[PDB]
Symmetry: D4
Subunit: 159 residues, 8 copies
């Protein structure tokens, strides 16, 4: 029941994208928390969140933000837990700024980066699941079923 994955985002405007990560974790029945934590507007909230994540039982953190998307990187700076980053599509640069601001982390503090947008949000959740599956047999089976259904469901020809 206690969250094992924390989904954080820079603002309400990132929800349209991050809701896909939330839906996926719920689909696979992975207990999680979904919050808004801004590295730029609420820096101390982020420091505390990231600093205490492990103690609180979190195993993986999924962070999404757009523009100068420093959220994933700063979260990883305070936690030893794996941090996965989702580049949110920005209005002008279509997430290219978001992507580079997240993936180009200097050696020493990693952030596993996913694709720009909804696909990336969904994949961060799936990646977090594949991580949890390493030590949770039941979930591992559900993840296998999920991947198997994805594969079997692809049509043979277009409509």
């Amino acid at each position: 029941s206690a969250p094992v994955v924390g989904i954080i985002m820079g603002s309400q405007s990132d929800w349209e994208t991050m809701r896909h990560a939330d839906a996926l974790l719920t689909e696979l029945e992975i207990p999680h928390e979904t919050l808004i934590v801004s590295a730029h507007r609420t820096p101390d909230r982020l420091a505390d969140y990231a600093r205490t994540a492990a103690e609180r039982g979190l195993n993986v953190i999924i962070a999404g933000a757009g523009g100068a998307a420093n959220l994933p990187g700063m979260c990883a700076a305070w936690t030893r837990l794996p941090v996965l980053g989702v580049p949110v599509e920005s209005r002008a640069l279509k997430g290219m700024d978001s992507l580079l601001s997240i993936v180009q982390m200097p050696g020493g503090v990693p952030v596993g980066t996913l694709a720009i947008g909804a696909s990336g949000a969904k994949n961060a959740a799936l990646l977090a699941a594949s991580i949890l599956a390493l030590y949770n047999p039941a979930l591992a089976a559900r993840l296998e079923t999920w991947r198997a259904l994805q594969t079997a469901s692809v049509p043979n020809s277009p409509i």
Copy 2:
């Protein structure tokens, strides 16, 4: 000492970059294997490697690739394990083609992508360690000590010559 992490790359030319992932895993005492698997030249080798990764005991796969960097993505298509991708810098486009070809995976098949080049390789190994640390207390302690040391080793001022 059975490998729990698998480092794969498309060619010998990728080693200059991927060696940083290898070095870090060894530093943290993480048993691993290092191989060359070409998505384009040895597709069936990749298929077999990826399909059996889990049954062979691997927990995380770190794949490096340049240009139409397909290795990480194709590996993830066959394994349920988490796959981390390292974009190898390319001659003309400086790794931008490698980066986009790896990170832009469609929803459903993830690849945790790291920075272009050496930094990315080192971080892929660090990310892999943080994943394994979740269920390995001894490793978790070693990683904690490693992160703590990194922070304490940062100088307070530059050597202004």
Copy 3:
């Protein structure tokens, strides 16, 4: 009657683009098959499709996909037949990711790449036709007529 060209695409979402390749081949009366084969979601389906293409009588394969568009490249990895790639326009990066993921193939395994989007889908079909025309006199004549009509139909002044 047996297909000599195979048109494959990563998903239904690529159809809006790949239908242009289908229409062109039909226009020139080139027998072909149009299927959905995902390198990421249905890897074994792709391996089998590409591996057996030649045996089945296919002469050219046209593959379209977007984002990390590895479909054309992986298809070429398993077949000796010429593979033509169509970069599908992606939501965020407008097909720049699709283009680079397809054209930047390392030496040893080629993929003839066409333009991003519908133009590219149409041109892949035309290129496949120009290839088949080398050993099919009847088709060669129809292709000549097609190119001649294209040229003669261009207006002299804008409306």
Copy 4:
């Protein structure tokens, strides 16, 4: 030994890149011609070369070009034969201008485009071979052997020094 493939480039500076296409065609025993045709400096030469390519027996044209890489596209405008384009790396933009100027052909006039640089030149020749192999059993066998050898020659592990 009449040429069945024509390799053309805009200038001598392109040879460093296009020589890889030449080498591969020769390796596979594919009769071909190699010439310099400037779309911008010798437009009429290009017009004549492209118009008569088919009647001269050519089956495939491989054109290399840099910067406002117009050669492949203009050649295709005049010939019904399949034209393959090789983006030659440029000084400032590293071939991105060459790539976009070649691959972005409007619907109706195709140019099968390969990777920027040497890899693209080699692949243009390989693609040309796969095209000719469709109606040349002997060549098809040589290409099959070449691909098979490439796959078998990939090492299983890197020389970790």
Copy 5:
């Protein structure tokens, strides 16, 4: 009455952009012709047009095209007259492909390139006018008036 400026474009789809060049030349009363000439679809039409431009009395050629926009460059290849290029905004790459395909002309054959889109079409016409003004006193005066009105008309504060 005889045209001194020729406006050519790759296709009807470029008209929405090139009409701005036409309107400007008409505004300044510069006799001109507006045609569709495709370097890819009507290469011989282009060769003849460019080759005979000077003989026909043309002083400047304004060429617009999108994508692999080779039109301006190829026109300049056949004429000694100044050729001005207008990069038409493409669907996917927003004219970045059009711009690079036009401006990056190798030394030896120039093309004066203007901005992507309508602004570029308008400026090609203005540039062509500034060229003609060097030997046409009446036009030079009208161009001076045009530039003076542009400058004087800019509001002092936004509405």
Copy 6:
């Protein structure tokens, strides 16, 4: 001689670029401090540095950073003082990743960004000086003289060899 400007950078490797900011401030007789603060390796050091900047007497902060250049932005999140950011050129992407990661701050937390590299560092210092000049007549005069000299020092023609 208490510092009124603080120059911070993520690592020693940034010094080659940031030294230009230091040199200019000294040239204009602007008391300042120069330190290394890593946003990613020493997050708490940055938090403390930024929070107390104003109470310590600092008026302007100049932060340099490369790659996922987070330093300028994170510093601004904690201080009410104006923060100027210098994008440090990166190996692969030539500072484009540094630039976008710094300039694209969301509304609400500003970072006055300068050009990539040495020019940006020099200009960050010049911008800082123009800010301080607003309430320091002596400095305003020195800056005026500096700008005037720059303009008067431009040659009228190139040394055409």
Copy 7:
């Protein structure tokens, strides 16, 4: 009552973006002027504006423009005052041209650059405020309140 900040923009079309800078300064009660000054269409107006800015009592200039956005740079060329630049989002290149045309100022003449678009306009105003706050205690307090409210107002979870 006399303006201490001058907001200038290349044209009326930049107002949709620059109005955000105007609103912010008004919110913090910072006396300012909002004008249209084009570096390309009204160069002498710009020279005079920038040249006399300091004499007129202005402390900071916020300049916004799109495309070949040389406005901030040229304004800084004539004034010793700090100039902040706002890259306006352009139609084709989404402000990438605007951004590079402003931020890449050679050493010797600075322009503090903000993000592309509305965010950048808002931040230029906030940056200008943080500058004025250094010598205006009352404003400094209002700026502290503004930043504090921004931070406290961020929701804890998405709706």
Copy 8:
């Protein structure tokens, strides 16, 4: 021998690129002047240079600039003469910043832009010549001969070593 073309650049560092424009004008016997005018460091010098260009007899202005390449555009704002812009390659962004900062002029103030670097400088001079050739028969003949020679000088095949 009064100048009819004016070549201006922002600094001595631009000369390496702009010298190609100078050389070509001289080759074609086109009287011209070559000066350094900084848009950012000597704004009033530029204002005066541009305003009086026409009255001084100049017919075409060729301006080179790098980075926030403002020179060509600002010059055009003050002169009714046609202005040609040469993007000078920049260190980090390889002239892309120079290119966009010059070519993207808003409707109403044109700048005929050439390629990034040396090729652009040479072509700016060639374009200037083609403009002057419209009302100078002698020059028109020299340009015709120059173009004809260029075409005739292109080799038919590469030196395949």
